[PDB]
Amino acid sequence: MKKVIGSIEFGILSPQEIRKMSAAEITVPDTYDDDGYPIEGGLMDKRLGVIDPGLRCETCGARAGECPGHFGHIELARPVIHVGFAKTIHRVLESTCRECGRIKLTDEEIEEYMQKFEVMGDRKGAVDKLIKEIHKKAKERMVCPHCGAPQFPIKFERPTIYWELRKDEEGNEYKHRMMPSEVRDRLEKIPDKDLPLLGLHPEKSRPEWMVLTVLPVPPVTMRPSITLESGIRAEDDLTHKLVDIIRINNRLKSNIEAGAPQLIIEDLWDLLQYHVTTYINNETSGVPPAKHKSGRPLK
Amino acid sequence: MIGRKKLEEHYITIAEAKELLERRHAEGLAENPEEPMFYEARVSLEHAERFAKLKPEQARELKEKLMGLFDWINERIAAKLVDILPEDYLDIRVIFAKEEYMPTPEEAEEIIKVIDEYRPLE
Amino acid sequence: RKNKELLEIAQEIGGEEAVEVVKALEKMKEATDEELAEATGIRVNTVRRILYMLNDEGLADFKRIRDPETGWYYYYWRLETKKLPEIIRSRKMAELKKLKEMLEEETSEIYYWCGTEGHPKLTFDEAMEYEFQCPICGKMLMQYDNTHIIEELKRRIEELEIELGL
Amino acid sequence: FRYTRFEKARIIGARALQIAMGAPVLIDVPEGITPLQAALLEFEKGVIPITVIRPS
Amino acid sequence: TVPEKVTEFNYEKLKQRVLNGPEKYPGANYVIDPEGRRIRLMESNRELIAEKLDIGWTVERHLEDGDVVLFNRQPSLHRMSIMAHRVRVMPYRTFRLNLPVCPPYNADFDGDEMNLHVPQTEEAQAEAKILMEVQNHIISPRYGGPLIAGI
Amino acid sequence: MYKLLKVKDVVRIPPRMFTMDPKEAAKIVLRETYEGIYDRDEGVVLAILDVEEISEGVIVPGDGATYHEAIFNVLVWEPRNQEVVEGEVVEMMPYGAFIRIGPMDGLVHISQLMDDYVVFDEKNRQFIGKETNRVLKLGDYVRARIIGVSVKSRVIRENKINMTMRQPGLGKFEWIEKEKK
Amino acid sequence: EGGLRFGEMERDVLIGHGAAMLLIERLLEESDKTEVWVCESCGHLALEDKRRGKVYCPVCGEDERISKVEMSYAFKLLLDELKAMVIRPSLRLKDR
Amino acid sequence: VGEKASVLARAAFEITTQHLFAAAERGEVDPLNGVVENVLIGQPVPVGTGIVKLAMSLPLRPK
Ligand SMILES: [Mg+2]
Ligand SMILES: [Zn+2]
Ligand SMILES: [Zn+2]
Ligand SMILES: [Zn+2]
Ligand SMILES: [Zn+2]
C-alpha cells in the first residue's frame, strides 16, 4: 500500500541468488537470423525480454511496449577471477595463513582491536588508516599461531596472475602459477568471525563470491538492435561480446571433457580470463580491446 | 500477515458464531446498493443452521467447565469437543486418534460425566 | 583400509580403470600422464580424464615442469591426502541432508498412481489437472500409494544417519 | 503558536488539495473562485483545523 | 492551460468555459473524466460534453487573470532570479515587466528574452504564491538593503 | 472451526466521508478490503465484527487523505491439517463427492470412503457398495477428517481441500450407529 | 518545438527558496513514473504473471508481504546496470 | 566532495569511480537524506517545506 524507498544496502551477488533470479540458461550463440521469424532458443526471447510483434514471453504475455526485461545466467564450467576486486584479493591472500583461517595475530591482539570498531562506525575516512596498519603488520610475518609456522612464501600480483616463491627441492624458488580454482578453495576456510577484522561482511559479501562462477546475462530490453540505413541490423555491442562468450564456452566444455591433450587447457583458460575482462571493462589495463570488425571499440 | 501484528486470538464454537453472522446479516440492510452478503458468507449461514446442537449461552458454560476439568485439555481441544458432542468412548477415540495423548477409559468417563449433562435429548 | 577407501571412490566414478590410476601414481610418487598410462595399459586420454575429477575433488596435485629443449610443459603429479575423513563426511552430510529433505517431503505428498508398468506416483496438484483419468496411457487413476516404501525409505535412511550423525 | 513561513505554505497547500476532492467548505461564497483562493480566505479567519506537530 | 478540478462553487463558471470551446479567449481545451481518459474538446462539437458536467471532473481552461506563474532570466546566478508573478493578459507579442523589477533579473531591454513556466498541481501552485512572490523579496540576503526600488 | 482475531492495521480514510465519526467511517472503508480473501497464514476472513479504538489522523505529502491506526476484531476460518470436521454432501459426481463443511467444500474420493468395494450407480447419482448394500447420495450428513490442503491463490474458489473417511467412526451418521453393535 | 532546459543551476535556485513540492513536479513528473513491487525481506524486484493475476518474488514464495514502490523509470534502469555486474542493490523500503 | 557523503553523492562527481565505487561494495549501507539522492529517486528533499509533518482530528462538524 504505497511505500517509499527507505534505504539501499549494497553488496555482492552470490552464485546461489543468481540461479533463482535467472529465468533461463542461455545456450545458443546466435542473434536473430534472418529477415523473418526472429525466434531462437538461446540469447533472444527465451523468456528474457520481448522486442518483436510476437506476444510470447514468460506466461505474462506483456507486449514489448512496457515490459521490464528479465535476467538470465550462464553456468561457467570453471571459476574466473573478477578483475574489479583483484587489488583487494591481494590484501586478503597475503594477510592470512593457508589451511588454518586465522589472521596471523594472537587472540589478545585481535581482542583489543575490536574496541576501535564501535567508536569509528560512521567515518569512512579514518577507518581506512586502521585497516592498512593491520594489513602492513600481517605482511611482514611468517609465524601463524595455529599451524606452528611452516615457512610461508610470499604472493605476487599484477595484472591478474598470482605466484608464490616457495621451496620444494632443497633451496629452489620456482614461480608456481596460480589458478582461480586454487585461490577460491583457499578463501572458503576463512571463518565468518574474521571478516569484520578485514574489510568484509558475513552475510552480504562473502570473499569466495569474488571468483565469478555464474555470469548474469542482461535482459533484451537493455540490448537494443539499432538499424543502419533501412534493412541492416547493426547488432548491439553487448550482444556480440556475449555471443563471443558462449562460442568459447561451448567449445570449452566439449574440448576438456572428451580428449585431454593438457596443452589446450592452458591457452583456453587465460583467453576466457582475457575475454571476461573486456566484458566488465573494455578500457582495462594490459588488455587489447576486443573490437568488432569495423575498428569501432565496443562500449 | 493480517496487519502489523496479531495481538489476541480466541477459539469460538460454531453455535455462538452463528449469532455474530446473523447480527452481521441484520446490518446491511442499507438499501443504497442493497448490499447483499457475498456468496461464501451466505453459504456459511445455511451450514450454521443445521449443526448448532446447543444454545449460545450454555456452550460458554461448558467451554469454561471443560477447561477446568484437566490440565491437558486446552481451549481448542475443549472447544472441539463442544462442536462434535461426543456420545461415548468411541467418539473420544476417533477425535484423539492422531493426538499426543490417548485418554484411558477411566479418565474419559470423567469427561463423559461432564458431557452427561447438556445432551439435547433428541 | 586407508589405502582401501581411496580406491573405492574413484571406482564409483571411473571404475576399474580408475582403480589402476590410483594404484599407479602411489607406486611412482612423481609421474606424468604417459608414465601412468604405460604402467597400467590404459590409453593416456582415459587415464587423464580420471585425474581431472580428482583434481576437482582436491585429492590430486601437480606442479608444472618446463621442458628446456622443446619449450613445453609436462606435469609431475603427487598426492595430497590430508583431507580424507572429512570429504567422506562433507559429501555424506549434505547428501543425507538431501535424504532428510526427501523423507520430510514424503509425509505430506504423493498419493495417486496410474495402474501401469510405468508412470505411477502422481501428485495431488497434477491429479486435479488430470481430472481423474490418465493423459499418458488413459487408465483410470487410483489412490493412496507407495505406503510401504515410504515406510521402507523411512527405514532405509534413518539408520544410515545414526552412523554419520556421530 | 505563531507559525513559521514554511509551515504556513504547507498548511494552505494541504488544505487546498482537500477542498478539490470534496471536503465541505465554510462560508466562502463569492462568485466562482479557484480551490487555492478558497483556502486563503478560510485561513485568514483562523479556522484551519490542521495543527503542526512540532519536533521537540 | 491549468487543470482546475470543479467542485461545487465554481461549477457555474467552468460550464461557460468548456462551452466556449478552444477558440474564444475564455475557453477550454481538454476535459478529464474521473477514469483518467482525456477527452479533447476540438472535433465538431462541445455541447454534449458541456451537459450535466457532474462534479469531480477536471477542465483545462486557458490562463485567466490571477493564476500564479514563475519567471526566469537564464543565467540563474543569484537566488532571486526566479520569482512568482501574477498573470495579466494584453494584446501584442512581448512580455511586459514592470520597471523596478529589473535589477533582480539583471535584465535590460534591448532584446533580452525570458521564459515563463506555469505550475499545475494544487499543492505546488499554492506553495509558489505564498513563498516566492515579489513583495517578500524587497530586501536582498546578500547585504542589508533594498534591491527592488527606483531606477 | 472458527476463530476470533483482534488485529491492528492502518486505514486510509478518503476525504469524501470526512464529515463522519472515524469509528463508523473507517469501518466501512476497512470492510471493503478484507471480506472474501484467503490469507495463507490464517485463512478466510468472513466479516469485520467491529472497530474498538482508532488513533489520530496523520497527513502525508502528496495524497491528501488521512492515515489512521485502527483496532478491530475479525472472524476467520482455518482448516488446519488433520482437524476433524463435519459437513453435508451437496454434490454428486461419478468419481467423488463434494461435501460443504463451511464456507468451502471438501472433496472425498470414492476409494477413501469405506472399507468395502463401492460401485457407482450410473442411472442415478449415488454410490452403492458391493458387500454391504449401503447407498450414499445427496443431502446426507457425514463426519470426515482433513488429509490435505492445497493453498494456491488468494481467491477462495481456487484453493482445494483433501479429506478422507476410511477410519472407524466416520461416514454417514446412520452407518456409524448400526455398526456400534 | 523546444525551449530551454532546467539543468544544474535551476535546481539549486529552487532549493534555496525551499520549494520542495514545486521541485519534484517540475523535474520528474513530466516524464514516466513506473510502479514496481518490492519484496520486504529479500530486496529484489518481484515478478508478475498475467492470465492468473498475481505477483511473486524469487526467494520467498508469496507468503511474504510484497509492497508497491513508485519510482522514476530512469532510476530503475540504473539498478539493472549494477545488477548486470556482481553488485546487489538491495532496496530496503521503510513504512509511511 | 571527495570525503565522506553518501555513495551516490560521489557517483555524479569525477567519473573515474570504478576503483572507489567498488570499494563501497564491501560492507556498507546508506539510508538517504542528502539532496541529490532524493532528487534522483523522486522523493521530497529534507530542506524547505519537506521538514514539516501535519496532524488533524476528524469529527469536523462544518458549522
Ligand atoms: Mg541584455
Ligand atoms: Zn515479461
Ligand atoms: Zn594455523
Ligand atoms: Zn496407467
Ligand atoms: Zn522475496
Numbering used by the authors:
A (entry chain A): 4 to 302
B (entry chain F): 1 to 122
C (entry chain G): 4 to 169
D (entry chain K): 2 to 57
E (entry chain A): 354 to 504
F (entry chain E): 1 to 181
G (entry chain B): 1027 to 1122
H (entry chain C): 327 to 389
What do the authors say?
For promoter-specific transcription, RNAP and general transcription factors (GTFs) are recruited to the promoter DNA to form the pre−initiation complex (PIC). In this study, we determined the X-ray structure of TFEα and the cryo-EM structures of three forms of archaeal RNAP, including the apo-form, RNAP–TFEα binary complex, and RNAP–TFEα–DNA ternary complex. The structures reveal that direct binding of TFEα can shift the clamp conformation from a closed conformation to an open conformation. Our results support the universally conserved mechanisms of transcription initiation in all three domains of life by showing that direct binding of TFEα, a conserved GTF in archaeal-eukaryal RNAP systems, can open the clamp of the stalk-containing RNAPs.
To visualize the effect of TFEα binding on RNAP and molecular details of the RNAP and TFEα interaction, we determined the cryo-EM structure of the RNAP–TFEα binary complex. To reveal the precise effect of TFEα binding on RNAP, we compared the cryo-EM structures of the apo-RNAP and RNAP–TFEα binary complex. In the latter, the clamp swings away from the DNA binding cleft at 11.8° relative to the apo-form RNAP, and this movement is coupled with the stalk swinging (4.7°) away from the clamp. The structure shows that TFEα connects two mobile modules of RNAP, the clamp and stalk. It demonstrates that direct binding of TFEα on RNAP shifts the clamp and the stalk conformation from a closed state to an open state. Two α helixes between the eWHD and ZRD form an α-helix bundle linker, placing the ZRD over 50 Å away from the eWHD and allowing the eWHD and ZRD of TFEα to locate adjacent to the clamp and stalk domains of RNAP, respectively. The hydrophobic patch of the eWHD (residues Y55, F65, W75, and Y78) faces the tip of the coiled-coil (CC) of the clamp domain and the wing fits into the cavity between the CC and clamp head domain. The ZRD establishes its interaction with RpoE in the stalk domain of RNAP via hydrophobic surfaces (residues Y114, Y115, F127, M131, F135, and Y147). The D128 amino acid of TFEα also forms a salt bridge with K152 of RpoE. The contact surface areas between the eWHD and clamp and between the ZRD and stalk are 632 and 441 Å2, respectively.
